[PDB]
Paper text:
The major histocompatibility complex class I–related (MR1) protein captures and presents small organic molecules to an innate-like T cell population called mucosal-associated invariant T (MAIT) cells. MR1 is ubiquitously expressed in all cells, but its cell surface expression is dependent on ligand availability. The release of MR1 from the ER to the cell surface involves a conformational change driven by a molecular switch involving a lysine residue (Lys-43) at the base of the ligand-binding groove. Here, we report that RF catabolites, including 10-formylmethylflavin (FMF), lumichrome, lumiflavin, and alloxazine, bind to MR1 with moderate affinity, while RF itself binds weakly.
Crystallization of MR1 binary structures is challenging, so we used the MAIT A-F7 TCR to aid crystallization. In the crystal structures of MR1-FMF and MR1-lumiflavin, the flavin rings of both FMF and lumiflavin ligands had the same orientation as for RF and as such were involved in a similar network of interactions. Here, the lack of ribityl tail in both FMF and lumiflavin disfavored the formation of “direct” hydrogen bonding with MR1-α2 residues. This shows clearly that RF catabolites are well positioned within the MR1 A′-pocket, allowing the stabilization of MR1 in the ER and reduced trafficking to the cell surface. Although lumiflavin and FMF have a very similar chemical structure, they did not form this flavin bond and exhibited markedly different binding modes and contacts within the MR1 A′-pocket, with their isoalloxazine rings rotated ∼90° relative to lumichrome and positioned closer to the MR1 α1 helix compared with the lumichrome, highlighting the malleability in the MR1 A′ and its ability to accommodate related molecules in highly distinct orientations. The RF catabolites described here were incapable of Schiff base formation, and we observed that while they could bind ER-resident MR1, this MR1 did not egress from the ER, likely a result of the failure to neutralize Lys-43, and instead caused a retention of MR1 in the ER, which in turn drove downregulation of surface MR1. Moreover, the absence of the ribityl tail in the RF catabolites, and the stabilization with a smaller number of hydrogen bonds together with the lack of a Schiff base in comparison with 5-OP-RU, resulted in IC50 in the micromolar range as revealed by the fluorescence polarization assay.
Numbering used by the authors:
A (entry chain E): 3 to 244
B (entry chain F): 0 to 99
C (entry chain C): 1 to 247, 252 to 270
D (entry chain D): 1 to 123, 130 to 178, 180 to 199
């Protein structure tokens, strides 16, 4: 119902940025929220109706345009690190009176950095199941590690014989900090996929851990020796054994 | 569609006495729809220094408002309220009854 | 005494040169407190005791809401004209509000009108909409399918509206809670030969609510009484009258703000 | 000023119930909303109350007491898929929404046959797995040693759930000491 873009974006301090939101539900009221750890959603700006907008609780550093009844754009005039957040656009049939609920877009994860040279894709490795687990339980747990990445813009998935799987999988909900004291610590994320021992013991079965990383865009300038840390997939794999 | 023509009442703020300063009221009420034109007259000529309330809303969905001006009544001067509304073919001039 | 808070909206389709498409005004008792229209697009106080007690953020917030309410009114009126297959200029009106009466009991009301006639009436006690004709019945069905919105309106009328009214009553207490007793006089005059008219005339009083009647020989009310409207005198006070024709002992009885007055005709 | 309070986190057991409270202190009140937000997803509307009572919608019910200024969201017959954050929001007297900071609901699976063990996996990784849900896993007291939170996986076709946590390092660290900072079951299997 509510479409907002982009889902992920890395910005340099001082850069300009526009978040787009559109709703095809004929709603009259639209909203831009930021969601930060440890606090309730905070309204940035809102638009009660086509043709009017007004500040919310945290308007500083932003402005908006109610372009038409469908669209409500959010601008960051000069990106600051404190604007690192998850941004949510929402709409409702009307605003003010009534019991009407909010309909939320999918969210935009923005990370604002002073130096893009801190952006790194993950390294990904797959650890094969222990033979002791196979004998003790008749089950086999593969473990995937995604390490050394920044920002925390990753989506991890498991693929068996070319089709994504969900049964037997558990991925950490939040990455951990490899350097917890540092404000810009890189991140690590782990996942497990558990299958039956016989399924692991079938060498025709192929297991792949996939990590989609969201990083720099083609527009960003890059002059380092290491490869431009662009949005990319990094994977590791193993085949069934013994 | 039901249009309702204005009731028009012209009266002094205080009981009137010739030569004593007073205020002349024109209360125009009960009309619908809301477009209305109201003038106070002294011997047929529109009075320029006139106060008026904003358009007001009644619970029966009609409208009302109040026009007034300071004045000193005399035996010879004739005061009136002139009202036009879609229900009227021409402006209606309602004469003050001199507090009778 | 009995106080009330109410807000009106008026929408006009295809307005003439000087008529706003949308006007909204609020009242406490007989006093305008707020105004908004499609020309200013700004909500503004109409009583000094409202302006002095509500900071700019309040007026800014409700300006934004009124701009939305204006747009919603415009669309609702367009849909009503379509149902009736009407063209040209028509009106749409809303009134919501509540009363706090002397005994501490409350009322709450919410009503719509089309072309100045009752259209839809909300009954908060049964949570239903009463419709005057089949077009209103069509709109009623839609509104009654939204149970949560019905419950929201009941809460607003019974709790929120009363709380706001009490707040405004305190803001305007020097105006709204004062008493100015009436000045009352009886005039007699022979009119048509053999016909004596008695006028009981009151002015200078506030609040506007006043009771006036004629009695005969102390016990019985007089048959054919003519009642004058309660009219604003322009200085914040009001005036009114009641009259009869005499043919044995007549008296005018006046009640204002808990004080009774009797004027015997000698 | 105005405030809306809900617990940061709640933990309950699969199959059981949980009641998530939301108290509010506002000058006026025009309704209370509950929203569900799975990790990494957008909030979605769950419920609305504005008068007093309890409104049921399947396994979820929402209660309001206007005079006590609180609401609760009741989840019956808890499932692992109910793990999410639950957001309360109140519409104040100027029709503005005040948002609670959210309650993260954690569900403990009913482990039918616990079998605690710490296995070593090769490409250096240690897997603490199959322990009972009453066990909690503590973070590592080493900057170069990383330990994950507990994770529940569901082998759906086998009707089998299991807890696990992962620890790793490249310091010259073995799986015998990996979870030393945690209180692990005494019968934990440490294969040789
Ligand atoms: C404080 C307050 C002010 C309001 N003002 C208006 C208004 O100006 N017009 C209207 O139709 N409704 C209002 N409503 C419904 C209001 C409601 C509240 C709570
Ligand atoms: Na006319």
């Amino acid at each position: 119902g509510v479409t907002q873009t982009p889902k992920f974006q890395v910005l340099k301090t001082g850069q300009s940025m526009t978040l787009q939101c559109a709703q095809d539900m004929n709603h009259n009221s639209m909203y831009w929220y930021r969601q930060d750890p440890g606090m309730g959603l905070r309204l940035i700006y809102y638009s009660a109706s086509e043709g009017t907008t007004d500040k919310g609780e945290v308007p500083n550093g932003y402005n908006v345009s109610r372009l038409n009844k469908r669209e409500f754009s959010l601008r960051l005039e000069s990106a600051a690190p404190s604007q690192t957040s998850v941004y949510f656009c929402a709409s409702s049939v009307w605003t003010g009176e009534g019991s009407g609920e909010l309909f939320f877009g999918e969210g935009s994860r923005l990370t604002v950095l002073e130096d893009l040279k801190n952006v790194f894709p993950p390294e990904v490795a797959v650890f094969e199941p222990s033979e002791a687990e196979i004998s003790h339980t008749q089950k086999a747990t593969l473990v995937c590690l995604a390490t050394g990445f920044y920002p925390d813009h990753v989506e991890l998935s498991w693929w068996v014989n070319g089709k994504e799987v969900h049964s037997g999988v558990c991925t950490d909900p939040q990455p951990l900090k490899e350097q917890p004291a540092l404000n810009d610590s890189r991140y690590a994320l782990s996942s497990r996929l558990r299958v039956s021992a016989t399924f692991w013991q079938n060498p025709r079965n192929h297991f792949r851990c996939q990590v989609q990383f969201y990083g720099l865009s083609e527009n960003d300038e890059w002059t380092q020796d290491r490869a431009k840390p662009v949005t990319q997939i990094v994977s590791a794999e193993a085949w069934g054994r013994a | 569609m039901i249009q309702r023509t204005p009731k028009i009442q012209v009266y002094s703020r205080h009981p009137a006495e010739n030569g004593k300063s007073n205020f002349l009221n024109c209360y125009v009420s009960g009309f619908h729809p809301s477009d209305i034109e109201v003038d106070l007259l002294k011997n047929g000529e529109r009075i320029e220094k006139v106060e008026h309330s904003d358009l007001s809303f009644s619970k029966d969905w009609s409208f009302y408002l109040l026009y007034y001006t300071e004045f000193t009544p005399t035996e010879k001067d004739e005061y009136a309220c002139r009202v036009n509304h879609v229900t009227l073919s021409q402006p209606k001039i309602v004469k003050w009854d001199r507090d009778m | 005494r009995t106080h009330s808070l109410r807000y009106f909206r008026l929408g006009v389709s295809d307005p003439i040169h000087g008529v706003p498409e949308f006007i909204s005004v609020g009242y406490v008792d007989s006093h305008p407190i707020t105004t908004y229209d499609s020309v200013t697009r700004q909500k503004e106080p109409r009583a000094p005791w409202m302006a002095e007690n509500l900071a700019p953020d309040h007026w800014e917030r409700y300006t934004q809401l009124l701009r939305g309410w204006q747009q919603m009114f415009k669309v609702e009126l367009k849909r009503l004209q379509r149902h009736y297959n009407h063209s040209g200029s028509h009106t749409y009106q809303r009134m919501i509000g509540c009363e706090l009466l002397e005994d501490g009991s409350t009322t709450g009301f919410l009503q719509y009108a089309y072309d100045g006639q009752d259209f839809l009436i909300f009954n908060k006690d049964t949570l239903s909409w009463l419709a005057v004709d089949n077009v209103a019945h069509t709109i009623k069905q839609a509104w009654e399918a939204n149970q949560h919105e019905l419950l929201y309106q009941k809460n607003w009328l019974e709790e929120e509206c009363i709380a706001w009214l009490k707040r405004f009553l305190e803001y305007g207490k020097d105006t709204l809670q004062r008493t100015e007793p009436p000045l009352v006089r009886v005039n007699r005059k022979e009119t048509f030969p053999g016909v004596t008219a008695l006028f009981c005339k009151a002015h200078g009083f506030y609040p506007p609510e006043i009771y006036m009647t004629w009695m005969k020989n102390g016990e019985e009310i007089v048959q054919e009484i003519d009642y004058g409207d309660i009219l604003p005198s322009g200085d914040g006070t009001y005036q009114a009258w009641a009259s009869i024709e005499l043919d044995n002992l007549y008296s005018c009885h006046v009640e204002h703000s808990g004080v009774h007055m009797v004027l015997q005709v000698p | 000023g105005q405030n809306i309070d809900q617990p940061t986190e709640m933990t309950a057991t699969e199959g059981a119930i949980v009641q998530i409270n939301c108290t509010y202190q506002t000058s006026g009140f025009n309704g209370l909303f509950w929203y569900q937000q799975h990790a990494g997803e957008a909030p979605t509307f769950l419920s609305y109350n504005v008068l007093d009572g309890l409104e049921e919608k399947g396994r979820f019910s929402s209660f309001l007491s206007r005079s006590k200024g609180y609401s609760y969201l009741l989840l019956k017959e808890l499932q692992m898929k109910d793990s999410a954050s639950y957001l309360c929001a109140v519409k104040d007297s100027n029709y503005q929404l005040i948002w609670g900071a959210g309650t993260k609901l954690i569900i403990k699976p009913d482990i039918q046959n616990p079998d605690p063990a710490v296995y070593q996996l090769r490409d250096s990784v240690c897997l603490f797995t199959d322990f009972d849900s009453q066990t909690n896993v503590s973070q590592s007291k080493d900057s170069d040693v990383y330990i994950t939170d507990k994770c529940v996986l569901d082998m759906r076709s086998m009707d089998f759930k299991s807890n696990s946590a992962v620890a790793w390092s490249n310091k010259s660290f073995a799986c015998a000491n990996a979870f030393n900072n945690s209180i692990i079951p005494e019968d934990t299997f440490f294969p040789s």
